[PDB]
Amino acid sequence: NSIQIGGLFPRGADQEYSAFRVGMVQFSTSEFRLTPHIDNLEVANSFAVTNAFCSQFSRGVYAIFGFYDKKSVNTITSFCGTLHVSFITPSFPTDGTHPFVIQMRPDLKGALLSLIEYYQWDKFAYLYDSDRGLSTLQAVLDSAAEKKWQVTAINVGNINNDKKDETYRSLFQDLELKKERRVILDCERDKVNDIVDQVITIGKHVKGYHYIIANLGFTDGDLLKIQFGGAEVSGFQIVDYDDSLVSKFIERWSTLEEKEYPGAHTATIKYTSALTYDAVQVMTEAFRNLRKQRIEISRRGNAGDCLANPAVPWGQGVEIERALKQVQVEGLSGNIKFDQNGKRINYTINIMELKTNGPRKIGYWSEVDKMVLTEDDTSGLEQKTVV
Amino acid sequence: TNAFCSQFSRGVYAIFGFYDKKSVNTITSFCGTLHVSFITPSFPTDGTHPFVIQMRPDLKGALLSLIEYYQWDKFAYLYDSDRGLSTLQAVLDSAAEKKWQVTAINVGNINNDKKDETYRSLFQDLELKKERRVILDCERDKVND
Amino acid sequence: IVDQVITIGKHVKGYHYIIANLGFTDGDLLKIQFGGAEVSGFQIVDYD
Numbered sequence: 151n152s153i154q155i156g157g158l159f160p161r162g163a164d165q166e167y168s169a170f171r172v173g174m175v176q177f178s179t180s181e182f183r184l185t186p187h188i189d190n191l192e193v194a195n196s197f198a199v200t201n202a203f204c205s206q207f208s209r210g211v212y213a214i215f216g217f218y219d220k221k222s223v224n225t226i227t228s229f230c231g232t233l234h235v236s237f238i239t240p241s242f243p244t245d246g247t248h249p250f251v252i253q254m255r256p257d258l259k260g261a262l263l264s265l266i267e268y269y270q271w272d273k274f275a276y277l278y279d280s281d282r283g284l285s286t287l288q289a290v291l292d293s294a295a296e297k298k299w300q301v302t303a304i305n306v307g308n309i310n311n312d313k314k315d316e317t318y319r320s321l322f323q324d325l326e327l328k329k330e331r332r333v334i335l336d337c338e339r340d341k342v343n344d345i346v347d348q349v350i351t352i353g354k355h356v357k358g359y360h361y362i363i364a365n366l367g368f369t370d371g372d373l374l375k376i377q378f379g380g381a382e383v384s385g386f387q388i389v390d391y392d393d394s395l396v397s398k399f400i401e402r403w404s405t406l407e408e409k410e411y412p413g414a415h416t417a418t419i420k421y422t423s424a425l426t427y428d429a430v431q432v433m434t435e436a437f438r439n440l441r442k443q444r445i446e447i448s449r450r451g452n453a454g455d456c457l458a459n460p461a462v463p464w465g466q467g468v469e470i471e472r473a474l475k476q477v478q479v480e481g482l483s484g485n486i487k488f489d490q491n492g493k494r495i496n497y498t499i500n501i502m503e504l505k506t507n508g509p510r511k512i513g514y515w516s517e518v519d520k521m522v523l524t525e526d527d528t529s530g531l532e533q534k535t536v537v
Numbered sequence: 538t539n540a541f542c543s544q545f546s547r548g549v550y551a552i553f554g555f556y557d558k559k560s561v562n563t564i565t566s567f568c569g570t571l572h573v574s575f576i577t578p579s580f581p582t583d584g585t586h587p588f589v590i591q592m593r594p595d596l597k598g599a600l601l602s603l604i605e606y607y608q609w610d611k612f613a614y615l616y617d618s619d620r621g622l623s624t625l626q627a628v629l630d631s632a633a634e635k636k637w638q639v640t641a642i643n644v645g646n647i648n649n650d651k652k653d654e655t656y657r658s659l660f661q662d663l664e665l666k667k668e669r670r671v672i673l674d675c676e677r678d679k680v681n682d
Numbered sequence: 683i684v685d686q687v688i689t690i691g692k693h694v695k696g697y698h699y700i701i702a703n704l705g706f707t708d709g710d711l712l713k714i715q716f717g718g719a720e721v722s723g724f725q726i727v728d729y730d
């Protein structure tokens with residue numbers, strides 16, 4: 151049983167693609183074996199993806215695992231609603247309800263909004279780039295009106311890397327305009343550090359300031375450079391390094407030859423890569439549950455050119471979508487379950503604040519129970535009471 | 538994509554058409570690659586894309602100054618999903634500059650079954666903050682609705 | 683010491699350091715140059 155799958159990896163996602171292979175051998179079987187035809191492409195270019203899709207499609211493919219961008223996502227979701235090809239991605243959740251998509255990434259919109267109510271914030275600023283959709287911004291915008299908050303929403307993405315020294319001082323002249331001491335960082339991990347390094351140098355990281363890192367990869371980036379500053383830094387985790395399942399992974403993964411599996415030698419792993427390694431598991435457990443049900447999926451003939459006019463949807467596509475979406479496996483990203491639209495459901499998200507001795511978990515956000523804390527601390531009001 | 542390659546294989550010299558917020562990333566990509574020349578009256582691109590002739594003049598600056606004109610400081614901004622969130626993010630970045638208090642509410646996703654109810658649900662919630670200053674920014678059809 | 687200072691936040695408006703040598707611009711200064719704090723030193727090689 152030789153199964154052909156198409157791979158869409160952006161330029162230099164080395165840890166993801168490395169984890170992609172260590173999953174191939176982890177979930178390797180003697181029943182069948184996934185034969186991946188991989189395409190290295192610039193994700194941003196819609197033309198590049200389109201021709202790579204047409205390369206994969208005419209070659210005959212059962213499923214595609216890839217990454218998209220806010221520029222490309224409406225090329226992938228448009229060609230996957232037509233040619234019924236299943237798409238697995240660790241990228242941001244789709245803006246709406248697109249079919250034949252398996253978003254390995256849990257919607258973060260739900261967690262962040264329930265976090266702000268915990269700190270009892272009322273006035274803050276929002277920093278974001280559109281790279282992971284304007285969905286998360288319209289979330290804090292809509293919720294702002296309901297219980298009256300005050301949010302300074304600033305687009306941070308469109309700054310070139312030739313003149314950026316005076317676009318950050320200018321930025322934080324508008325953020326002293328209302329004594330802004332509470333800032334949300336909903337950005338790419340790179341833009342997070344570019345912001346932080348700049349914030350370090352204008353010294354807005356002492357006691358009084360409070361940051362929220364709105365991505366599923368908190369301990370992914372650098373945090374030591376804001377470890378002794380004093381300011382409060384909050385973020386989200388999803389790759390629990392205390393869970394024994396990932397702990398075994400961490401034992402092996404941190405000890406691989408670094409030349410073989412690039413940027414994988416650490417005792418830590420990015421959430422995008424920890425989704426890819428969990429994405430392989432779901433694709434494997436789906437193609438076992440297709441032969442277990444004895445249902446056949448073998449492509450009758452070639453698919454032909456993808457621009458086929460009129461286009462023919464090969465029937466077994468709607469079954470592969472079904473099988474994929476009904477899989478329930480346990481991986482790095484905790485629990486993996488989907489619904490009729492590919493959205494991750496019944497998932498754990500960790501809330502992690504920064505402290506002196508390191509990062510620390512005060513609790514978790516549930517998709518059903520909202521923000522629920524963890525009992526491991528002593529009472530703070532518990533001082534010396536005088537008789 | 539099909540309609541483009543259809544015209545491209547026909548070897549036309551310049552394409553005239555439209556697009557949506559979703560499709561524009563396809564049009565622009567195939568033009569900056571195949572050197573295809575495109576002309577459109579739909580909303581201006583989100584940057585500097587080559588081989589594109591936007592007949593629609595940049596609307597942003599005109600709107601921004603009109604608020605600056607009327608000496609507003611606290612207004613409501615209903616918005617549609619259509620012509621991008623360009624003329625919204627503009628007034629939401631300038632919010633801090635000239636001291637504004639912007640209430641932005643999405644309206645481009647109302648169902649036509651309860652259209653008359655949701656439109657009366659919004660405004661009877663806008664007498665909460667009693668905001669009597671509203672900018673619309675919509676497809677002319679959604680305006681009269 | 684400078685590197686250590688930046689990390690702990692003792693280089694904002696409210697602090698003042700005096701670099702006691704003949705080569706102020708000889709070292710690195712850009713890592714606190716925007717910090718708001720005032721830093722003084724001494725130059726012995728006038729580039730002008």
Ligand SMILES: *[C@H]1O[C@H](CO)[C@@H](O[C@@H]2O[C@H](CO)[C@@H](O[C@@H]3O[C@H](CO)[C@@H](O)[C@H](O[C@@H]4O[C@H](CO)[C@@H](O)[C@H](O)[C@@H]4O)[C@@H]3O)[C@H](O)[C@H]2NC(C)=O)[C@H](O)[C@H]1NC(C)=O
Nearest residue numbers: 477478479480481483484485486487488495496497498518
């Ligand atoms: C939504 O997501 C929930 C969180 O992942 C998920 O939760 C769990 O439910 C399953 C089964 O109900 C739990 O699995 C078990 O753990 C117990 C205790 O360690 C084991 O004994 C058990 O072994 C079972 O043993 C049976 C013996 O006859 C055997 O027949 C069964 O097949 C099975 O092997 C399971 O290993 C899991 O731990 C739960 N997670 C939690 C809360 O920690 C929900 O299922 C999911 N909701 C739905 C309805 O989709």
